[PDB]
Structures are given as structure tokens and as C-alpha cells.
Symmetry: D2
Subunit: 303 residues, 4 copies
């Protein structure tokens, strides 16, 4: 696929690098508002490519117009979290970015899939889609999903490959582990020595903890989001707990649920969850819709 | 994963080779009735591994008791089709193989996923599961699925990665394209100039044509079935049109539908298809049922 | 790289499949004299590609004029060995193939690297280069090299990645282990309990044993030769004991020594071997020379 | 291989991640003096591994004693460059680190290969080896080597895979392009529209420029150094322009030259360079020896 990267900070570089070395990206165009940053990143990539024999076309640029004719456009441009902040605290800052980008990108990338990475991720995806009128998805709870699998595997001292399942609903701190999907070698997680609250808590806290020590999350979400790109680019049909757009009281919202990710996106698999999980996903919709409306008014308090 | 390969003929060797070089198999045990065959294949694999730096343990054996402790057991032991034959002609001869394997493998590989390759594939899976009571899947129409995708791509002169969709129902000559799933860059196949009947006919005829010219199918189903193994081994959650066990009229039958394939298998997604494709999948259940009951009688009439 | 495959039998198909799934081949054109064979192999490859997201162009053809513009041309067209035969028995029959290919391929593929696989491999490379004057290499003793490594590893019950070293000189039954290059975790092989003669004998006999049981060698040399292709295609600079053209007594001959393989081929490293291994490589030149002159006379005595 | 990482800053993380995802590292132990940093990096890795199905054992730790029984030990612990500094300016700061590590690591990792990454790289490798008495190599001019190939490919608008060759001698700013190795599709670089001084200059300046804009080099040298790890771990025998130890006036020094990198290291290929290149490598030895002796005295001016 041809993939545009809007944002070449820590997470944008990690995602682009990981997606490029995985072989899923035939051509990439990497943009950033910071002078020379994308350009120097391009050189980094070429140097890396030489050792691997990678021939992917890469352009690092400060010119937004170079992001044209892409299949997928990955948006990580935004303020990141500082210790002590919630993700939703960023709404007003980063929504202005999305509003601006929504004016500019569409005419150059008609029919592209837009992949939101910038936080608060689900909200950003809704804002971007509202303004751009372009099909937009959010990395959503796919990162949470993998964090959950890896914690459970570490806890039982089993390979992560023995664990299956997803995290879903609202993003981050408000996500829910979808326990009816969670299986260990095919068996319900109940059959195991697993404290469900300890799993949820690790998932919600570990990014905050990475931020406090390292300064931001990189390798994990970078790899994970790149795999979303790869599933689209190779048409692999991986079920991923991304957030796809839904209509709710005539407003576009984004909420996560296991979703088939291929050259085409969908369907989402919420209808196949157990009752409790389906109730949590309905709930997540109502809560998201309420918090997002509030946030839109508070932004409308521009003047 | 630890993977058992039962049957080391053309397709068995291809699946094993491809699953091993893909990185999805940590240990493999390969069995065949043919004296020394498994041994010499093992030496072939070792030679290949040396150039790749692959360290997977591999044992080729003529003693079936050496296949123990597997996570996945792949069965390709059986007589293949000859130009002229139908897949289902093989039922009696190959059912006898499955009944015997079902009395030997499970005690050594309890709780393994059993992946049926030998034809008639779906019926063999049903027999094996009947005589073993171990969880058994069939390659099903996943091969057809890929043939369909590839045909549409070469026809429209587009990358295969632009095409999404599945083939399902009964296996082989009785399969149906699930047209409500076939999309080109997200758009319904009707918006393109492809003749649905030409697609079907290609899918149905190409294996018979390859069998006529080359003598048997290898690289295609081998790679495609190795990817089923990989999706289980790495818990990738790819939607694949494999055939999983379904309770119908109190019998266990196998029919293909798009199904989540990870360390855990399922759910199948037939409830998300359109009315027409759900009708077709319901008829396939009925038809498979009637034909399997008939075939079972034929088997009794041998023994 | 753009890669031409001349001969789509057992080994040709294996090399091509393995080189294509490794990512080293951007475009491939596969030729065989057998009507429809290349075509049906192409369809096999396309089916495999769909599951992997591989977009390499591939053309199977019965018209040799379709092989043009290649960077590398791989020749496996020829009669194979039967239980009992020696590799060199094939000289006359296969030399006739090479003389013809040499009058047809170069005009269409000027400046390509020609990689000889058909046996007797080294002698075929010398003939092809004689009649084509195009730069021609032979798989040489790279296959032997890997067999030797793998044997030592299984013997000492160590990972194959712990073993380094090469097999060189004449090909096959006349090859010699270059013992000054064989190291286990950096240490000379003498410090371990391996019998040098048992290693040699294994290396010499295993292909004949595989040919006896299975009918021909495939996965091992196929993977190993595909890695020669990859090392050229990605300019990896792997030292491989291939046979490159050497001017001796004003003839061009082919003998194996560890050689740098990248987008450019060479140098060969025989001047860095110990006295004994340099002696052996000098005798192989003399012996190959005398035997090739004899074989050329035999060819004249056919035509 | 089992690989220890001493240092989990920007370059240590990039190298470890790249080496891990490439599949060359079976077990890694990552240490850093910064509290909690390695630990949080380990979590990042596990999260990334979950999406890929990677089962490599990883331990991120603040306890140096955990770095035991490794095959390879990769040392990136040290002060990095700030704009305006040369690499050799760091000698006195980072040599103290190496002296300390030389007391501590050996008894826990007997017979390991130590891979120096921290600057001034060649000097650091000599210091570490002097004090530890352990076999030590330096990433050397391998990074420069790839930078050169990629620049030339960009300049001629050809794939980097068409370019072959190496940079060698002293490190960084004092490196020399070894023009007799440099080939484009097999042809001498003279046959091409290439300004040699412009190539050298780009190579020497581009890291300084990345540092000024981004803050440090990451992806390129990370990938490149990881490929050195991979060549050792898979015993691939890639020729790489690393710096291996040589004796000079009874002192151990490190200088770069194309070197065969496998489970065993060596031989270096300086003897096969043209005259001019060989003279530059002799020269580099004399100059290195002089600057390193000076630096050792200036450090001995501890008191
Ligand atoms: N799982 C996830 O979804 C996930 C993971 C990691 C980070 N993030 C989020 O991604 C965003 C970026 O994080 P980061 O660590 O890379 O931050 P960072 O500060 O390293 O980078 C942000 C980048 O965005 C750029 N930027 C800001 N405004 C821009 C504009 N108008 N146009 C173009 N570029 C612009 C900056 O120049 C900078 O290079 C943050 O919102 C962070 O919270 C999300
Ligand atoms: N897409 C698919 O599902 C697919 C693709 C290719 C082949 N097949 C089927 O796979 C089967 C094998 O095809 P093939 O081309 O490899 O045939 P083959 O003759 O090359 O190999 C069959 C192997 O099974 C062995 N065998 C027979 N009975 C056995 C037993 N009781 N235990 C162990 N091994 C036994 C034979 O010894 C032989 O080595 C056939 O039924 C064929 O129709 C299915
Ligand atoms: N390590 C090695 O170097 C190695 C390994 C395996 C096989 N081989 C050699 O490779 C050759 C092929 O072995 P195989 O097992 O694939 O034999 P095979 O009979 O399976 O295949 C040979 C193919 O070459 C074709 N052929 C014959 N003449 C031709 C021509 N003029 N143009 C195009 N195609 C032509 C045949 O039609 C057939 O499809 C043999 O000489 C064998 O000894 C070498
Ligand atoms: N091609 C190359 O060889 C290459 C490429 C990039 C960077 N580097 C060099 O590598 C070194 C590290 O660079 P970076 O960008 O990762 O710097 P950085 O500041 O991001 O990280 C340096 C790390 O070393 C750690 N450290 C310092 N002293 C230590 C000790 N005594 N024990 C353990 N850990 C210690 C720090 O805690 C820090 O995390 C520098 O010398 C830099 O110049 C070399």
C-alpha cells in the first residue's frame, strides 16, 4: 500500500518504521510541521533500508501537499500526554489540528482510509471524520487488547500465543476487557488462576507508567498500529479491536469492538459477544456520545 | 507451536516446509507409513534450515508413537485425486485411514487442534472427529477463497491485496462464492466488470487443470494451509473460510464459513452475511448432511 | 530483482517458490518446454501469493522470448540423476541444453547473472559461459556446505547457528570440506569429538539417499539456492561456497570456494585458507580442467 | 542467540527491538543504570510481541548481574554527542564506563562476543578489550558503509540493492570510502556519474545533521547494528565493515575493514583490497594507534 504519515514524532516514526520493515508499505510519504524532522527521518530510513535490501519509496517532507494519492493516511500529529493528564484532556488542543487537517488532506487523497492515532484517539477520529467527511478509523482498544494478552501470558508463565481475546468500548482508562472473548488455549479464562481486576488495572495503568519513566509509549503501540496497517495492506482479515464509525443520534462516534480488518473494513463483531459484553458496548456508546458532545461545546467556546 | 504432520507426501511436505520457514512451527514431528520417507525429508529440512538459521526441532519418523504432545496435528495422509475423479470418490478409502488415526493420535496428543487436509476434506474432518472426539477443523474453502481473490485481481489487473472476500459452503465443486463479502478496495464487486460465473468456474476448475498438467496441487494449498497453521500458532485472529465442526440434526458436520482463527477457533461469521449468502450456507448444511449420511452407509458396506 | 527461471521441474519450482516467498524476487518469468506446465505453476504461485499479500509479477510461459530484461537467470533445465548415476554422466545430454539456451537467452537478458543449477553443475556453468560469454555462476558446493553444517550440529546436539564453515573444490562426490574454515562457536573443529571422515561421507551420500527414497532432492537445495538469489538481490554480501568463473590455462572453469555474494560477485577467498585447504583447491582446478577437456571431446563426439 | 544489552537509551532500544523482531534473538537481557527504564522497555517489547506472536524471552532489568550466560553482549551505555562535538571528545567520559563494565561483565558471560556501540566506538572497543581481556568488536564503519550505498543509490535514482561496497579505516569523520569495493551492478563506480568527494562528505556529515535536528541517530544505525547481531546469530557470513581487534606495537586497536561475520568472526579482507585502499588501511592503523595512546595518557591524567 501507499501510506501517508501525518506526524513524525516518536509514535509516527515507530509506526512508519515498523510498517516499512514489515514490508506492508510500498511507498510512504512522511510529513511533520517541525522543520527538517521528516527529512532527517527519511535519511534514517534509507540507511536502514540499505542493510535489509528494502526498496520501498520513501519521502520525508515538510510539504503537506506531498501527501497525495495515498491508500491509507495515518494521523499521529498532536500533543501527547504528560504525567498526570488523562487522554481526554488533550481534546481541545488536538481537535483544532484535526479540523485543520480535515480541510487540507481530502482533496489530495480521495477515497483513502484515515487511521487516527493522536489522542484522545476515538474522539479525534470522530472530529476528523465529521469535518473531513472521509472514512476514518481509530487504533482504539487494539493496543489495550495486546497489553491484556501479554499480561495474562506473563502472569501464567505461558507463551502470549496461548492467549486470545479483546479489550473494547471507550478508549484507554474507560475501556473494558471483553471477558467472553478471552481464552487460554481455547478455554474460558474462569478456568484459570486469573484475577480479572488485576488484568484491567495493569492495562489501564501501564501506559501512564511508561510515560512517567520513558516520556511516551513507542514500541508497543507502534508495532501494534503498524500491524493494523499491515492487515489492511495485505488484506489479511485480522480481527482487531479498532474503533470504527457508528451513527448515534445522527452524530458519528467511534467505539472499539473486534472488527474484521482487510482491504475492506468490517464487519464489527459486537453482535456475537455474550450479553454482559454487549451491554458494556451499548453503554460505552451512550457514555462516549455524552462526553464527546460536551467536549464539542467546550471547543465551541472558542467564541 | 508444536506441530504434528501425518502424511509426508506432496502436499504434506509442502505444508510442513512452508509452515516451518514461516516461523510458526517451533517443533515438528513428521510421520508417514512409507519407510524412510520421513527420515529423508527431515534431512532435507535440516539442510534448508542451516542457510536460514532456523533452529526448530524436527523429527521425521516411521513410528506414530513419536507424535506426542502436539499443539496442532495436520493430517494429509490419504489417496489423492486423479484426473477424472471427484473429491468425494475418495471417501471410503480415506475414511479408513481417518478411523485408524483417530484410535492412535489422540492418546498421544490430547486436546490438540486437528487440521484436516486429506480429501474429501470436510467429510474427512467429520469422520475423524466422529472416531476421535477431538476438536477437528478442515482446510475447507480457504484454498478456494484465495483462488477467487487471485482470479479477480489478475482479471482487473490490480494487486491481489485490493481484493477481499470469501468462498464458503460445501467444499470444492460444490462451493459458493460468498458475494456479499467480495469487495475491491472496499467497494462491492457489482461496481466492477467481473463476471461472477466466470469467477466460480475458474475456482472450480483450476485444481483439476493443475492436477491434469502437473499431477497434483502443491504450492498454492500448501501455502494457504500453512497460513491457517500460522494464524493459530501466532494467535493472529485472521478470518478464514475454514470448516469448523457444527452440530446439525444431532450430527457433527463440517461446512465452510468465514471464521476467526486464533489460538482459539471461532466464532464463525455466517450470521453477518446477507440473506442470499446465508441461504446458500444453510443449503450446504442440508446437502452435506444428506451426502455424509449416504457416505457413512457406504463405509459400513465396506467393513 | 527480476528473475528468470529456466526449467520448472521439481527443483526449479522449489527455487522459484522459495525465492519469491523470501521477498527477493520482484518479478519472475518462468519457462519450461513442457506445454502448460509453466502456466499452471504460475496459477499455483498466484494462489499462494493471495494469502501472503505478495504482489510480485509472475508469468509462466512456453515462449522463451518472454524471458527478457532479467537481472538474474536461473537455469535448472536438464535431466536429473537416477539412483546409480553419477552427476557427470549427464554432461553430454545437458550440455546440449546449455548450448541452445546460450544462443537464445543472452540477446534478451544482456548482462544478467546466470545461475547454474542443472547438473553436472560446475561443468554446465563452464559450458554455458563458453557458449554465451555471459557471466555465469554455479550453485557449486553451497548445498554441500549447508549439509556439512547441519550434520555437525545434529551430531553434537547443538543449534546449526553454532556451526560455521565451508565445503569447496569440485562439486558433489569430489568436494572437500575446507576444515580450516569449520568452527563451532568460534573454536576449531578439532577441539570437538567429530569424525571428519564421517562428515565427508554424510555430505557425499545424503543426496543419493534422498534420491533413492523420495526420487530427487528439493527443499534443501531449493532453499539454499534461493538464498544465493536473495543474497545477490538484496546485496547482502554473504560468503557462500558457490563456483565462480576462473581463468585457468586459458580456459574458463568453475570450482567452488567461499566467495562474497552481493549485487556484485566476488572476491573469492581461497587466498585466506590454510595451506592444506589451498592445496586442495589447487588440485580441484587441475582435476576439473582435465575432466572438462575430456568431457568437451565427448560432446564433440556426439554432435 | 542469547543477547545482552548494556544500555537502553535510544540506540540500545532501537537495536534490541530491531534484533528481536528480526528473529535473531531467542533471549535478551536488557540492562540500564537509569531506574525503571529497562523494565518499562520490557513491557513495551511484550506488548509488541503479542501482535507478532513473538515468544522470545525478554528481561528488562536494573540488576547488572542478570546479564549472564549471554552469547553476545552489546554495549551502548555512554554519553552521546551534542551538536558541535566530535565523537572522540567523549573518550574520557565513556572510557571510565568501559573500565567499570570490564571489571563486572566477564565473569558472568565467559567466552561472549562483545559488540561495542558506544562512542568513540573503535576506541571504546579497544579500551574495553584491554581491560576485560574479552574478544570485542566494534560496529565500526558498517553504518558509514550503508550510508554510502544509500546515497549513491539516491543520487543515481537506482535501487540501493544495485550498489555494493564498503567504508573502512578509522571511525566516522576519519573513515575512508574503499573505492575499490564500490560497484554499481557489478561495474566500477568510475563508469558512473558519481562525485566521490560529495559521497564522502555526505557520509561524514549526515549523522551530525540528524543529531542537530532530531537529537540523535536511531533507526539507521539501530537496524544496521542489529543486522551485525543477526549475521552472528544466524551464522550468515555477511561481509561487514566492522572493526575487529588487531595488535599494533603490542597494543590492541580496532580499525574497520570488510570482515566475514558469522558464528565465528573473520577473516578480515584487507589483503584483497587494491593498493590505494590497503595503504589507507595501514595509514588508519598508524593514526588510530597515535590518537588512542594520546587519549589513554589524557585519561591517565586522572592522577
Ligand atoms: N495508542 C495510541 O493511540 C497512541 C500511542 C502513542 C502515542 N499516541 C498519541 O499520538 C500523539 C503523538 O504522540 P508522540 O509521542 O509521537 O508525540 P511527539 O511530541 O513525539 O510528536 C508529536 C508530533 O506531532 C507533530 N505535530 C504537532 N502538531 C502538528 C500539525 N498541526 N501538523 C503536523 N505535525 C504536527 C509535532 O511536530 C511532533 O513531531 C499524541 O496525541 C499521543 O498521545 C497514541
Ligand atoms: N486443499 C486441500 O485440502 C488439498 C490440497 C492438496 C491435496 N489434498 C489431499 O491431500 C491428500 C494427500 O495428497 P498428496 O498429493 O500429498 O498425496 P501423496 O500420495 O503425494 O501423499 C499421501 C501420503 O500419505 C501417506 N499415507 C497413506 N496412508 C497413510 C497413513 N495411514 N498414515 C500416514 N501416512 C499415510 C502416503 O504414504 C503418502 O506419502 C489427498 O487426499 C489429496 O486429495 C488436499
Ligand atoms: N544442488 C543442485 O545444484 C541441484 C539440486 C537439485 C537438482 N539439480 C539438477 O537440476 C536439474 C533439474 O532437476 P529436477 O529435479 O528439477 O528435474 P525435473 O525433471 O523435475 O525438471 C527438469 C525440467 O527441465 C525441463 N527441461 C528440459 N529441457 C529443457 C529446455 N531446453 N528448456 C527449458 N526446460 C527444459 C523439463 O521439461 C523439466 O520440467 C537436474 O540436472 C538435476 O541434477 C541440481
Ligand atoms: N553507529 C554507532 O556506533 C552509534 C549510533 C548511535 C549512537 N551511538 C552512541 O551510543 C551511545 C548511546 O547513545 P544513545 O543515543 O542511546 O544515548 P542516550 O543518552 O539515549 O542513552 C545512553 C544510555 O546509556 C546509559 N548509561 C550511561 N552510563 C551508563 C552505565 N555506566 N551503565 C549502564 N547504562 C549507562 C544511560 O542511562 C542511557 O539510557 C553514545 O555514545 C552514542 O554516541 C553510536
Amino acid at each position: 500500500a501507499k501510506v501517508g504519515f501525518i506526524g513524525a514524532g516518536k509514535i509516527g516514526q515507530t509506526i512508519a518504521y515498523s510498517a516499512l520493515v514489515s514490508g506492508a508499505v510500498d511507498e510512504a510519504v512522511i510529513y511533520d510541521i517541525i522543520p527538517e524532522l521528516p527529512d532527517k527521518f527519511e535519511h534514517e530510513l534509507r540507511h536502514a533500508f540499505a542493510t535489509k535490501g528494502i526498496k520501498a519509496n520513501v519521502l520525508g517532507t515538510n510539504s503537506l501537499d506531498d501527501v497525495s494519492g495515498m491508500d491509507i493516511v495515518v494521523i499521529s500529529a498532536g500533543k501527547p500526554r504528560k504525567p498526570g493528564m488523562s487522554r481526554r484532556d488533550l481534546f481541545v488542543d488536538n481537535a483544532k489540528i484535526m479540523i485543520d487537517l480535515a480541510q487540507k488532506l481530502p482533496s489530495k487523497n480521495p477515497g483513502a482510509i484515515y487511521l487516527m492515532v493522536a489522542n484522545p484517539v476515538d474522539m479525534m477520529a470522530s472530529v476528523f471524520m465529521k469535518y473531513s467527511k472521509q472514512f476514518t478509523i481509530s487504533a482504539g482498544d487494539q493496543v489495550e487488547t495486546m497489553r491484556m494478552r501479554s499480561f495474562i501470558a506473563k502472569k501464567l508463565k505461558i507463551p502470549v500465543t496461548s492467549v486470545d481475546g479483546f479489550v473494547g468500548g471507550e478508549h484507554g482508562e474507560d475501556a473494558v476487557v471483553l471477558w467472553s472473548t478471552v481464552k487460554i488455549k481455547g478455554k474460558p479464562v474462569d478456568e484459570f488462576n486469573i484475577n480479572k481486576d488485576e488484568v484491567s488495572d495493569y492495562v489501564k495503568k501501564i501506559p501512564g507508567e511508561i510515560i512517567r519513566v520513558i516520556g511516551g509509549t513507542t514500541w508497543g503501540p507502534g508495532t501494534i498500529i503498524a500491524d493494523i496497517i499491515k492487515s489492511i495492506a495485505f488484506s489479511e482479515n485480522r480481527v482487531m479491536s479498532i474503533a470504527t464509525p457508528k451513527e448515534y443520534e445522527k452524530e458519528i462516534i467511534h467505539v472499539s469492538a473486534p472488527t474484521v480488518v482487510g482491504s475492506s473494513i468490517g464487519p464489527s463483531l459486537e453482535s456475537l459477544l455474550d450479553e454482559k459484553d454487549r451491554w458494556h458496548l451499548n453503554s460505552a456508546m451512550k457514555d462516549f456520545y455524552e462526553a464527546y458532545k460536551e467536549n464539542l461545546k467546550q471547543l465551541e467556546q472558542a467564541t
